Amino acid sequence: LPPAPRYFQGENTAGFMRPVRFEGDITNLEVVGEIPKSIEGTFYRVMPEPHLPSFIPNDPWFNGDGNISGFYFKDGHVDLKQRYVRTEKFVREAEARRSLLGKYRNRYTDLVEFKIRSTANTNIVYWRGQLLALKEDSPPYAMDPETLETFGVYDFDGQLPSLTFTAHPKFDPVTREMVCFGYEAKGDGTRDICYYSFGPDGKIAETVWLVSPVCGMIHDFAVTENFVIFPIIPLVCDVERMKQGGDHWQWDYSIPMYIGVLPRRGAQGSDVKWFEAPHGFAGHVANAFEDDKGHIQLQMAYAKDNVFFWWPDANGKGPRPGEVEAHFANFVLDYQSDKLPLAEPTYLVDDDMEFPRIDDRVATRKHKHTFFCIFDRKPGVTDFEFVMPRAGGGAPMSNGLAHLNHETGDIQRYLPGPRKLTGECIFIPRNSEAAEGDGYVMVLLANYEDMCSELAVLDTKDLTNEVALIKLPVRLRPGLHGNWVDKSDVDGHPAPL
Amino acid sequence: LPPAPRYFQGENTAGFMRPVRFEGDITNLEVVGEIPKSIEGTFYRVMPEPHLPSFIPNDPWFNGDGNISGFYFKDGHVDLKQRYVRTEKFVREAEARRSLLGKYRNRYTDLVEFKIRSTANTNIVYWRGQLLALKEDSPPYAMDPETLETFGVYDFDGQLPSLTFTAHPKFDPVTREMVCFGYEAKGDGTRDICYYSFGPDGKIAETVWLVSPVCGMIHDFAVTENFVIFPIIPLVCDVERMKQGGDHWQWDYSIPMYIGVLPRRGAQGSDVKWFEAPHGFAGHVANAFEDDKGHIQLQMAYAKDNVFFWWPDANGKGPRPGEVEAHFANFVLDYQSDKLPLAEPTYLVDDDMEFPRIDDRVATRKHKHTFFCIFDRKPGVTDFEFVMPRAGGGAPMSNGLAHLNHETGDIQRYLPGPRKLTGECIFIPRNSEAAEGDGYVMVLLANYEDMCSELAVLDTKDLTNEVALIKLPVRLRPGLHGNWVDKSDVDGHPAPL
Ligand SMILES: Oc1cc(O)cc(/C=C/c2ccc(O)c(O)c2)c1
Ligand SMILES: Oc1cc(O)cc(/C=C/c2ccc(O)c(O)c2)c1
Ligand SMILES: [Fe+2]
Ligand SMILES: [Fe+2]
């Protein structure tokens, strides 16, 4: 077999990116300042964190085993629980005590035959009393919210129609539906998209099979009252390339950024319209909604080149690390229009940004607050001379959060400091009567001075000030998505405004 | 109540001394070099590690909650399991989410009434299929060797005759007895010593009550074929001082270092002889044995002043940090002698040393190998300018190990490096046929450059060279005693030579 290294090597596992691989508990975390005593609930986040050194050199960050952190808050106290998702990969590799799964999304490079290849490492959401650990090439893994025990692969009581489940389902706050899809829904390289939804009782509602113009990556999507919207990243899959040991994904400079629009209820596959936005990278969706005219306002991060630069075009052409910026874009779509080309979007702010969150009490409806990561290259904001030698590689960098008020246009920026970087934030309603966007924001910080992680708690009345800073004595490796589950919400999701 | 701080403050919890407080698992530890594949068994060690910030300022290191590490070795792979002892203190403080126990060994400063005040933080030994987590003011806590679950306070099937159980029992490799004692055996300030032993079937054998000349600290003891030996540290307890909120222990410059000798079998309390060694500090016992003439050779660390300088005499007189050296001393005792004063000991080496280990296959008999920590102040051995600002305070420092061959007088020294310090080592017989002192040595390192811990594996054929270096991504706080439990030993203890 390819040799199994016994320690981690390469930039993607150096410095702050070095795997820790701890599972267990740290109760009664140290706190500087004061956690608001009324906060009650749990912040769950997931990080890729290889349990064993890969036999693939420079294995991408996205291919690491999913490790779940839960921060449990009550009466101004907080405990951490941490546990790996027991994926097929995790379990079989743990049994063998070596890596067996090969290249990202390429089963032809695996050392054994896997049924499920999930690392369950991208998102962790709450649904009907369980956590669902998500990875877009796979079904979810169900987990216990209290103990973080893995129950196993989840198929929604045998109803799951797709081989794949998006890392970005949307929760309709009015209908209490979970709205979902999967791409490559019938296997490697397929252009099949399965759009599907579940009512709050757990029964499947929608199931519509449609066909993508290309086999492209659909990482995120958007949902409005009457439509679902599928933006396609111009990364394209050719299974024949994969069979020869090549990459699942390859950039295509010759195609637009497709944006499919399908009626949300009662549609057939042929009802989808594939609009054509200017060539670019579809980043994360903040939210979409229908305005007065019934036009879709789609607000999302959008770049003009390949953010995933390690998967270049057929001739190896693409950007370098740190070159591509994404901007907060507004696209306008009209399902009734027969004109497929779309205009350039308008931009809501000028910041290099990503990882937008809204108050999910208005998800699928008009929102007027967005919170998001920023990367500000303004001199002094990050001490690069200090940070970069300690940082390792393979993950995006965020050196602040921003809050945009969409009515006033006001922006507040949280800067944790010159030797700290941030993950994706969560928003917590102050209480069940709170106005949209009024409450608390939490975000995990990487502190390169201490080589420790911290959890910051902010009040939305002044995002520039930490009300509390929770000081972890270990590193939590840079991670992906996370979610707040409030104790006052019976189904784990906040009530509509 | 006294306010409960929400983060750690003071030098005793700064830098490398900052509590981490993690419990759980890290499997498949990273390894540089190669762990000998024939090593099979578990290294258990205990560290004091406060679970909650104390309401006592500058609480001594010895007062921290005991946290058990197990390093499980098989076929050149190693896993870490880590868990706090569930003492009464740990559990009640965890329930309250704040410190309740007060000053070291002073119940008059506690915020609630405790039945058992153990932190179980000093030693962790194997006995009849359980671990025993030891603390000299208390009975043992029994734990599961595999899971590190705490069973509870252990009273040896109701046979335990003493309120106290030493952190330093001896295991007779010929008789398979565990030889024990407790001082302050009837409670605070009592001069009662209870000497007791258990056969390999778990039945109590010896039980002898004797009387100390003063209520002094008896941290360690020694066992030979026919005698047990009790060296008394000139720290003395006055309960009236304690009731006014003072220290349990106070140095007394006016007394000798008493060394009691009692016949090992069939004695009465009045059979003890209290010999009087020159005033000094009784450190850890390497081993004792009877020579040809029937004289006791007692080999132990010995200092000429108060190593525990934070407990000075009644007038505050005592040494400063880093001032007191302990030396490897040989005392000669003759139970038949009626002369109580003893001569100054001879010294086996020049090094400032402590934490001696022998090949326990010759415990209570003549040994000719000792392994021990050293602290070399010679310029360059430790980079103090780098280390001391990162070190915190409250714990002893060791910047190498030494192996003394008592026959040849040869010494090898292991120096981990200028920015690393060591804990207490363990010795592992190469196999069941190995000669005395032939095999492997393991020792936990504090790496002040990485602010991480490492576990070093050395071969006794060349102590200067690391065969393997196991790289932990977390800190294990400086700890106290630990033990090897070999898989080939059914009762957990090695076979006699
Ligand atoms: O900084 C960014 C920006 C972005 O727009 C998307 C991502 C992550 C996408 C992703 C895609 C596939 C995976 O398997 C996976 O773990 C993650 C990260
Ligand atoms: O560096 C040294 C040298 C020594 O000779 C003894 C000790 C530890 C003794 C001890 C005494 C009482 C306790 O409660 C405890 O946790 C530890 C540490
Ligand atoms: Fe995402
Ligand atoms: Fe000791």
Side-chain angles (χ1 to χ4, degrees), chain A residues 6 8 18 21 23 25 27-28 30-31 51 76 79 97, chain B residues 6 8 18 21 23 25 27-28 30 51 76 79 97:
Chain A
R6 289 296 297 273
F8 289 100
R18 185 194 170 190
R21 309 182 298 109
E23 309 189 278
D25 300 277
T27 64
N28 294 289
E30 297 185 69
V31 181
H51 193 224
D79 307 325
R97 292 187 179 273
Chain B
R6 289 297 298 273
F8 289 101
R18 185 194 168 192
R21 308 183 299 108
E23 311 189 279
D25 300 277
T27 64
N28 295 289
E30 299 187 72
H51 193 224
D79 307 325
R97 292 191 177 273

PDB file of all heavy atoms in Angstrom, chain A residues 6 8 18 21 23 25 27-28 30-31 51 76 79 97, chain B residues 6 8 18 21 23 25 27-28 30 51 76 79 97:
ATOM      1  N   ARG A   6       3.510   8.785  10.004  1.00  0.00           N
ATOM      2  CA  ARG A   6       3.202   8.661  11.424  1.00  0.00           C
ATOM      3  C   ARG A   6       3.194  10.029  12.119  1.00  0.00           C
ATOM      4  O   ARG A   6       2.953  10.103  13.325  1.00  0.00           O
ATOM      5  CB  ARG A   6       4.191   7.683  12.073  1.00  0.00           C
ATOM      6  CG  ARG A   6       3.969   6.228  11.677  1.00  0.00           C
ATOM      7  CD  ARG A   6       2.632   5.685  12.148  1.00  0.00           C
ATOM      8  NE  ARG A   6       2.522   5.675  13.611  1.00  0.00           N
ATOM      9  CZ  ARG A   6       2.941   4.683  14.398  1.00  0.00           C
ATOM     10  NH1 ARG A   6       3.495   3.600  13.873  1.00  0.00           N
ATOM     11  NH2 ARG A   6       2.789   4.764  15.709  1.00  0.00           N
ATOM     12  N   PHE A   8       2.182  14.472  10.931  1.00  0.00           N
ATOM     13  CA  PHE A   8       1.649  15.325   9.881  1.00  0.00           C
ATOM     14  C   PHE A   8       2.776  16.156   9.263  1.00  0.00           C
ATOM     15  O   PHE A   8       3.636  16.650   9.977  1.00  0.00           O
ATOM     16  CB  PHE A   8       0.529  16.205  10.437  1.00  0.00           C
ATOM     17  CG  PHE A   8      -0.738  15.458  10.761  1.00  0.00           C
ATOM     18  CD1 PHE A   8      -1.033  15.091  12.064  1.00  0.00           C
ATOM     19  CD2 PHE A   8      -1.617  15.093   9.757  1.00  0.00           C
ATOM     20  CE1 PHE A   8      -2.188  14.385  12.357  1.00  0.00           C
ATOM     21  CE2 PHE A   8      -2.780  14.398  10.051  1.00  0.00           C
ATOM     22  CZ  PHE A   8      -3.060  14.037  11.348  1.00  0.00           C
ATOM     23  N   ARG A  18      -2.157  22.519  12.353  1.00  0.00           N
ATOM     24  CA  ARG A  18      -1.783  21.206  12.842  1.00  0.00           C
ATOM     25  C   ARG A  18      -2.970  20.566  13.557  1.00  0.00           C
ATOM     26  O   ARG A  18      -3.515  21.138  14.504  1.00  0.00           O
ATOM     27  CB  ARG A  18      -0.593  21.287  13.794  1.00  0.00           C
ATOM     28  CG  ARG A  18      -0.093  19.923  14.244  1.00  0.00           C
ATOM     29  CD  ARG A  18       0.837  20.034  15.437  1.00  0.00           C
ATOM     30  NE  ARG A  18       1.135  18.735  16.026  1.00  0.00           N
ATOM     31  CZ  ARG A  18       1.759  18.538  17.185  1.00  0.00           C
ATOM     32  NH1 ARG A  18       2.157  19.572  17.913  1.00  0.00           N
ATOM     33  NH2 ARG A  18       1.975  17.309  17.624  1.00  0.00           N
ATOM     34  N   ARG A  21      -6.940  16.707  17.292  1.00  0.00           N
ATOM     35  CA  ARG A  21      -7.610  15.410  17.201  1.00  0.00           C
ATOM     36  C   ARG A  21      -8.110  14.937  18.570  1.00  0.00           C
ATOM     37  O   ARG A  21      -8.253  13.733  18.801  1.00  0.00           O
ATOM     38  CB  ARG A  21      -6.684  14.372  16.557  1.00  0.00           C
ATOM     39  CG  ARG A  21      -6.086  14.843  15.240  1.00  0.00           C
ATOM     40  CD  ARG A  21      -5.216  13.816  14.560  1.00  0.00           C
ATOM     41  NE  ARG A  21      -4.086  13.478  15.394  1.00  0.00           N
ATOM     42  CZ  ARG A  21      -3.920  12.328  16.022  1.00  0.00           C
ATOM     43  NH1 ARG A  21      -4.825  11.365  15.900  1.00  0.00           N
ATOM     44  NH2 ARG A  21      -2.845  12.128  16.767  1.00  0.00           N
ATOM     45  N   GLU A  23     -10.984  14.444  21.429  1.00  0.00           N
ATOM     46  CA  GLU A  23     -12.411  14.285  21.651  1.00  0.00           C
ATOM     47  C   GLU A  23     -12.628  14.213  23.155  1.00  0.00           C
ATOM     48  O   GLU A  23     -11.886  13.511  23.834  1.00  0.00           O
ATOM     49  CB  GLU A  23     -12.955  12.940  21.166  1.00  0.00           C
ATOM     50  CG  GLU A  23     -12.614  12.565  19.764  1.00  0.00           C
ATOM     51  CD  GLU A  23     -13.417  11.337  19.377  1.00  0.00           C
ATOM     52  OE1 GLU A  23     -12.999  10.198  19.722  1.00  0.00           O
ATOM     53  OE2 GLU A  23     -14.491  11.537  18.807  1.00  0.00           O
ATOM     54  N   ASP A  25     -14.317  16.505  26.772  1.00  0.00           N
ATOM     55  CA  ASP A  25     -15.011  17.592  27.447  1.00  0.00           C
ATOM     56  C   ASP A  25     -14.011  18.533  28.103  1.00  0.00           C
ATOM     57  O   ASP A  25     -12.964  18.103  28.594  1.00  0.00           O
ATOM     58  CB  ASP A  25     -15.963  17.064  28.521  1.00  0.00           C
ATOM     59  CG  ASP A  25     -17.045  16.152  27.967  1.00  0.00           C
ATOM     60  OD1 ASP A  25     -18.063  16.680  27.474  1.00  0.00           O
ATOM     61  OD2 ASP A  25     -16.837  14.927  28.003  1.00  0.00           O
ATOM     62  N   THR A  27     -15.224  21.495  30.741  1.00  0.00           N
ATOM     63  CA  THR A  27     -16.338  22.199  31.358  1.00  0.00           C
ATOM     64  C   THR A  27     -15.836  23.490  31.996  1.00  0.00           C
ATOM     65  O   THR A  27     -14.640  23.645  32.243  1.00  0.00           O
ATOM     66  CB  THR A  27     -17.051  21.304  32.376  1.00  0.00           C
ATOM     67  OG1 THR A  27     -16.129  21.021  33.426  1.00  0.00           O
ATOM     68  CG2 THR A  27     -17.569  20.021  31.758  1.00  0.00           C
ATOM     69  N   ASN A  28     -16.765  24.415  32.246  1.00  0.00           N
ATOM     70  CA  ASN A  28     -16.484  25.620  33.012  1.00  0.00           C
ATOM     71  C   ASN A  28     -15.327  26.393  32.377  1.00  0.00           C
ATOM     72  O   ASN A  28     -14.345  26.706  33.034  1.00  0.00           O
ATOM     73  CB  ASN A  28     -16.241  25.266  34.480  1.00  0.00           C
ATOM     74  CG  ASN A  28     -17.490  24.715  35.143  1.00  0.00           C
ATOM     75  OD1 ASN A  28     -18.450  25.452  35.381  1.00  0.00           O
ATOM     76  ND2 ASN A  28     -17.511  23.419  35.413  1.00  0.00           N
ATOM     77  N   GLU A  30     -12.884  29.175  31.022  1.00  0.00           N
ATOM     78  CA  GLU A  30     -12.459  30.463  31.531  1.00  0.00           C
ATOM     79  C   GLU A  30     -13.141  31.567  30.736  1.00  0.00           C
ATOM     80  O   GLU A  30     -13.235  31.471  29.511  1.00  0.00           O
ATOM     81  CB  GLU A  30     -10.952  30.647  31.396  1.00  0.00           C
ATOM     82  CG  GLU A  30     -10.133  29.672  32.198  1.00  0.00           C
ATOM     83  CD  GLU A  30      -8.645  29.965  32.118  1.00  0.00           C
ATOM     84  OE1 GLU A  30      -8.221  30.995  32.663  1.00  0.00           O
ATOM     85  OE2 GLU A  30      -7.910  29.159  31.528  1.00  0.00           O
ATOM     86  N   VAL A  31     -13.575  32.614  31.449  1.00  0.00           N
ATOM     87  CA  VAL A  31     -14.279  33.731  30.847  1.00  0.00           C
ATOM     88  C   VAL A  31     -13.672  35.040  31.344  1.00  0.00           C
ATOM     89  O   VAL A  31     -13.531  35.242  32.544  1.00  0.00           O
ATOM     90  CB  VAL A  31     -15.778  33.689  31.181  1.00  0.00           C
ATOM     91  CG1 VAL A  31     -16.518  34.852  30.540  1.00  0.00           C
ATOM     92  CG2 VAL A  31     -16.402  32.360  30.788  1.00  0.00           C
ATOM     93  N   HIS A  51      -7.955  12.692  11.171  1.00  0.00           N
ATOM     94  CA  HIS A  51      -7.676  11.853  12.324  1.00  0.00           C
ATOM     95  C   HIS A  51      -6.343  11.131  12.142  1.00  0.00           C
ATOM     96  O   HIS A  51      -5.667  10.818  13.119  1.00  0.00           O
ATOM     97  CB  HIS A  51      -8.845  10.898  12.562  1.00  0.00           C
ATOM     98  CG  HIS A  51      -8.798  10.220  13.884  1.00  0.00           C
ATOM     99  ND1 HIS A  51      -9.054   8.877  14.038  1.00  0.00           N
ATOM    100  CD2 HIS A  51      -8.553  10.703  15.117  1.00  0.00           C
ATOM    101  CE1 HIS A  51      -8.954   8.563  15.322  1.00  0.00           C
ATOM    102  NE2 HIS A  51      -8.650   9.657  15.998  1.00  0.00           N
ATOM    103  N   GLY A  76     -24.696  32.125  32.279  1.00  0.00           N
ATOM    104  CA  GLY A  76     -23.404  32.789  32.207  1.00  0.00           C
ATOM    105  C   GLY A  76     -22.212  31.836  32.318  1.00  0.00           C
ATOM    106  O   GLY A  76     -21.072  32.303  32.405  1.00  0.00           O
ATOM    107  N   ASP A  79     -19.745  25.193  28.790  1.00  0.00           N
ATOM    108  CA  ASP A  79     -18.975  23.965  28.681  1.00  0.00           C
ATOM    109  C   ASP A  79     -18.763  23.605  27.210  1.00  0.00           C
ATOM    110  O   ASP A  79     -19.651  23.830  26.388  1.00  0.00           O
ATOM    111  CB  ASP A  79     -19.701  22.794  29.349  1.00  0.00           C
ATOM    112  CG  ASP A  79     -20.118  23.044  30.789  1.00  0.00           C
ATOM    113  OD1 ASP A  79     -19.374  23.755  31.533  1.00  0.00           O
ATOM    114  OD2 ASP A  79     -21.141  22.473  31.177  1.00  0.00           O
ATOM    115  N   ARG A  97      -5.899   1.872  11.776  1.00  0.00           N
ATOM    116  CA  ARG A  97      -4.891   2.807  12.259  1.00  0.00           C
ATOM    117  C   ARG A  97      -4.075   3.374  11.099  1.00  0.00           C
ATOM    118  O   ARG A  97      -2.880   3.616  11.244  1.00  0.00           O
ATOM    119  CB  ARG A  97      -3.970   2.166  13.306  1.00  0.00           C
ATOM    120  CG  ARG A  97      -4.640   1.825  14.630  1.00  0.00           C
ATOM    121  CD  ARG A  97      -3.599   1.363  15.640  1.00  0.00           C
ATOM    122  NE  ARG A  97      -4.136   1.039  16.964  1.00  0.00           N
ATOM    123  CZ  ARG A  97      -4.321   1.909  17.963  1.00  0.00           C
ATOM    124  NH1 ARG A  97      -4.046   3.195  17.807  1.00  0.00           N
ATOM    125  NH2 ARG A  97      -4.777   1.496  19.131  1.00  0.00           N
TER     126      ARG A  97
ATOM    127  N   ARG B   6     -13.370  33.720  37.576  1.00  0.00           N
ATOM    128  CA  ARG B   6     -13.875  33.035  36.390  1.00  0.00           C
ATOM    129  C   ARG B   6     -12.753  32.749  35.388  1.00  0.00           C
ATOM    130  O   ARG B   6     -13.002  32.168  34.329  1.00  0.00           O
ATOM    131  CB  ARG B   6     -15.019  33.844  35.773  1.00  0.00           C
ATOM    132  CG  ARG B   6     -16.299  33.838  36.598  1.00  0.00           C
ATOM    133  CD  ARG B   6     -16.927  32.466  36.756  1.00  0.00           C
ATOM    134  NE  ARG B   6     -17.330  31.895  35.476  1.00  0.00           N
ATOM    135  CZ  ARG B   6     -18.502  32.100  34.876  1.00  0.00           C
ATOM    136  NH1 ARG B   6     -19.415  32.878  35.439  1.00  0.00           N
ATOM    137  NH2 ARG B   6     -18.759  31.539  33.705  1.00  0.00           N
ATOM    138  N   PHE B   8      -8.128  31.909  35.563  1.00  0.00           N
ATOM    139  CA  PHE B   8      -7.003  31.636  36.439  1.00  0.00           C
ATOM    140  C   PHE B   8      -6.072  32.844  36.472  1.00  0.00           C
ATOM    141  O   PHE B   8      -5.812  33.452  35.441  1.00  0.00           O
ATOM    142  CB  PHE B   8      -6.275  30.367  35.986  1.00  0.00           C
ATOM    143  CG  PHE B   8      -7.042  29.097  36.237  1.00  0.00           C
ATOM    144  CD1 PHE B   8      -7.731  28.472  35.209  1.00  0.00           C
ATOM    145  CD2 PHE B   8      -7.106  28.545  37.506  1.00  0.00           C
ATOM    146  CE1 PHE B   8      -8.464  27.320  35.453  1.00  0.00           C
ATOM    147  CE2 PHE B   8      -7.824  27.384  37.740  1.00  0.00           C
ATOM    148  CZ  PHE B   8      -8.509  26.780  36.716  1.00  0.00           C
ATOM    149  N   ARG B  18      -0.631  26.954  33.275  1.00  0.00           N
ATOM    150  CA  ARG B  18      -2.038  27.239  33.066  1.00  0.00           C
ATOM    151  C   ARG B  18      -2.820  25.937  32.905  1.00  0.00           C
ATOM    152  O   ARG B  18      -2.509  25.132  32.028  1.00  0.00           O
ATOM    153  CB  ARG B  18      -2.252  28.116  31.836  1.00  0.00           C
ATOM    154  CG  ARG B  18      -3.700  28.548  31.651  1.00  0.00           C
ATOM    155  CD  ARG B  18      -3.955  29.117  30.269  1.00  0.00           C
ATOM    156  NE  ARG B  18      -5.382  29.266  30.008  1.00  0.00           N
ATOM    157  CZ  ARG B  18      -5.925  29.529  28.817  1.00  0.00           C
ATOM    158  NH1 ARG B  18      -5.161  29.669  27.745  1.00  0.00           N
ATOM    159  NH2 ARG B  18      -7.237  29.638  28.694  1.00  0.00           N
ATOM    160  N   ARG B  21      -7.423  21.290  31.595  1.00  0.00           N
ATOM    161  CA  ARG B  21      -8.630  20.747  32.214  1.00  0.00           C
ATOM    162  C   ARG B  21      -9.439  19.889  31.236  1.00  0.00           C
ATOM    163  O   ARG B  21     -10.658  19.748  31.388  1.00  0.00           O
ATOM    164  CB  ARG B  21      -9.488  21.868  32.819  1.00  0.00           C
ATOM    165  CG  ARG B  21      -8.700  22.785  33.743  1.00  0.00           C
ATOM    166  CD  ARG B  21      -9.539  23.858  34.406  1.00  0.00           C
ATOM    167  NE  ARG B  21     -10.128  24.717  33.406  1.00  0.00           N
ATOM    168  CZ  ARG B  21     -11.410  24.741  33.076  1.00  0.00           C
ATOM    169  NH1 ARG B  21     -12.275  23.960  33.700  1.00  0.00           N
ATOM    170  NH2 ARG B  21     -11.831  25.535  32.108  1.00  0.00           N
ATOM    171  N   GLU B  23     -10.637  16.385  29.502  1.00  0.00           N
ATOM    172  CA  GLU B  23     -10.821  14.961  29.722  1.00  0.00           C
ATOM    173  C   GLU B  23     -11.287  14.351  28.409  1.00  0.00           C
ATOM    174  O   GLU B  23     -12.162  14.923  27.759  1.00  0.00           O
ATOM    175  CB  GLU B  23     -11.960  14.628  30.684  1.00  0.00           C
ATOM    176  CG  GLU B  23     -11.965  15.383  31.978  1.00  0.00           C
ATOM    177  CD  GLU B  23     -13.017  14.793  32.898  1.00  0.00           C
ATOM    178  OE1 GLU B  23     -14.211  15.122  32.749  1.00  0.00           O
ATOM    179  OE2 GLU B  23     -12.647  13.914  33.667  1.00  0.00           O
ATOM    180  N   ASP B  25      -9.994  11.652  24.894  1.00  0.00           N
ATOM    181  CA  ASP B  25      -9.108  10.763  24.167  1.00  0.00           C
ATOM    182  C   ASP B  25      -8.406  11.509  23.040  1.00  0.00           C
ATOM    183  O   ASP B  25      -8.986  12.398  22.415  1.00  0.00           O
ATOM    184  CB  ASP B  25      -9.876   9.583  23.573  1.00  0.00           C
ATOM    185  CG  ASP B  25     -10.569   8.727  24.615  1.00  0.00           C
ATOM    186  OD1 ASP B  25      -9.903   7.857  25.194  1.00  0.00           O
ATOM    187  OD2 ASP B  25     -11.759   8.962  24.860  1.00  0.00           O
ATOM    188  N   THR B  27      -6.222   9.481  20.146  1.00  0.00           N
ATOM    189  CA  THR B  27      -5.680   8.214  19.692  1.00  0.00           C
ATOM    190  C   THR B  27      -4.614   8.455  18.624  1.00  0.00           C
ATOM    191  O   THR B  27      -4.545   9.531  18.037  1.00  0.00           O
ATOM    192  CB  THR B  27      -6.797   7.308  19.163  1.00  0.00           C
ATOM    193  OG1 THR B  27      -7.375   7.940  18.021  1.00  0.00           O
ATOM    194  CG2 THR B  27      -7.863   7.030  20.203  1.00  0.00           C
ATOM    195  N   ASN B  28      -3.765   7.441  18.409  1.00  0.00           N
ATOM    196  CA  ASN B  28      -2.805   7.429  17.316  1.00  0.00           C
ATOM    197  C   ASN B  28      -1.927   8.677  17.368  1.00  0.00           C
ATOM    198  O   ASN B  28      -1.828   9.425  16.395  1.00  0.00           O
ATOM    199  CB  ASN B  28      -3.526   7.282  15.978  1.00  0.00           C
ATOM    200  CG  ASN B  28      -4.230   5.950  15.848  1.00  0.00           C
ATOM    201  OD1 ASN B  28      -3.583   4.917  15.698  1.00  0.00           O
ATOM    202  ND2 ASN B  28      -5.546   5.966  15.906  1.00  0.00           N
ATOM    203  N   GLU B  30       1.017  11.286  17.206  1.00  0.00           N
ATOM    204  CA  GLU B  30       2.114  11.510  16.281  1.00  0.00           C
ATOM    205  C   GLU B  30       3.410  11.037  16.919  1.00  0.00           C
ATOM    206  O   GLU B  30       3.636  11.268  18.109  1.00  0.00           O
ATOM    207  CB  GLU B  30       2.269  12.990  15.932  1.00  0.00           C
ATOM    208  CG  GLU B  30       1.048  13.585  15.262  1.00  0.00           C
ATOM    209  CD  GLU B  30       1.269  14.998  14.763  1.00  0.00           C
ATOM    210  OE1 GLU B  30       2.002  15.126  13.765  1.00  0.00           O
ATOM    211  OE2 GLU B  30       0.735  15.962  15.393  1.00  0.00           O
ATOM    212  N   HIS B  51      -9.650  22.208  38.594  1.00  0.00           N
ATOM    213  CA  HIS B  51     -10.773  22.190  37.675  1.00  0.00           C
ATOM    214  C   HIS B  51     -11.466  23.555  37.657  1.00  0.00           C
ATOM    215  O   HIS B  51     -12.050  23.944  36.652  1.00  0.00           O
ATOM    216  CB  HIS B  51     -11.718  21.042  38.040  1.00  0.00           C
ATOM    217  CG  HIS B  51     -12.732  20.761  36.985  1.00  0.00           C
ATOM    218  ND1 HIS B  51     -14.059  20.541  37.275  1.00  0.00           N
ATOM    219  CD2 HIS B  51     -12.611  20.639  35.647  1.00  0.00           C
ATOM    220  CE1 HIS B  51     -14.714  20.323  36.145  1.00  0.00           C
ATOM    221  NE2 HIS B  51     -13.855  20.373  35.143  1.00  0.00           N
ATOM    222  N   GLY B  76       3.875  -0.527  18.497  1.00  0.00           N
ATOM    223  CA  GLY B  76       4.494   0.710  18.047  1.00  0.00           C
ATOM    224  C   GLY B  76       3.501   1.862  17.870  1.00  0.00           C
ATOM    225  O   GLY B  76       3.890   2.917  17.376  1.00  0.00           O
ATOM    226  N   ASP B  79      -2.021   5.483  22.219  1.00  0.00           N
ATOM    227  CA  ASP B  79      -3.194   6.317  22.428  1.00  0.00           C
ATOM    228  C   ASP B  79      -3.155   6.938  23.823  1.00  0.00           C
ATOM    229  O   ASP B  79      -2.715   6.285  24.770  1.00  0.00           O
ATOM    230  CB  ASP B  79      -4.483   5.499  22.313  1.00  0.00           C
ATOM    231  CG  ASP B  79      -4.619   4.696  21.034  1.00  0.00           C
ATOM    232  OD1 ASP B  79      -4.158   5.167  19.970  1.00  0.00           O
ATOM    233  OD2 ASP B  79      -5.251   3.637  21.100  1.00  0.00           O
ATOM    234  N   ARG B  97     -20.297  24.579  40.370  1.00  0.00           N
ATOM    235  CA  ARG B  97     -19.577  25.362  39.380  1.00  0.00           C
ATOM    236  C   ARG B  97     -18.726  26.430  40.058  1.00  0.00           C
ATOM    237  O   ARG B  97     -18.579  27.528  39.529  1.00  0.00           O
ATOM    238  CB  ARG B  97     -20.527  25.976  38.348  1.00  0.00           C
ATOM    239  CG  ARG B  97     -21.201  24.970  37.424  1.00  0.00           C
ATOM    240  CD  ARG B  97     -21.910  25.677  36.283  1.00  0.00           C
ATOM    241  NE  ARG B  97     -22.529  24.795  35.302  1.00  0.00           N
ATOM    242  CZ  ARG B  97     -21.917  24.262  34.231  1.00  0.00           C
ATOM    243  NH1 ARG B  97     -20.631  24.483  34.002  1.00  0.00           N
ATOM    244  NH2 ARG B  97     -22.597  23.508  33.385  1.00  0.00           N
TER     245      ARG B  97
END
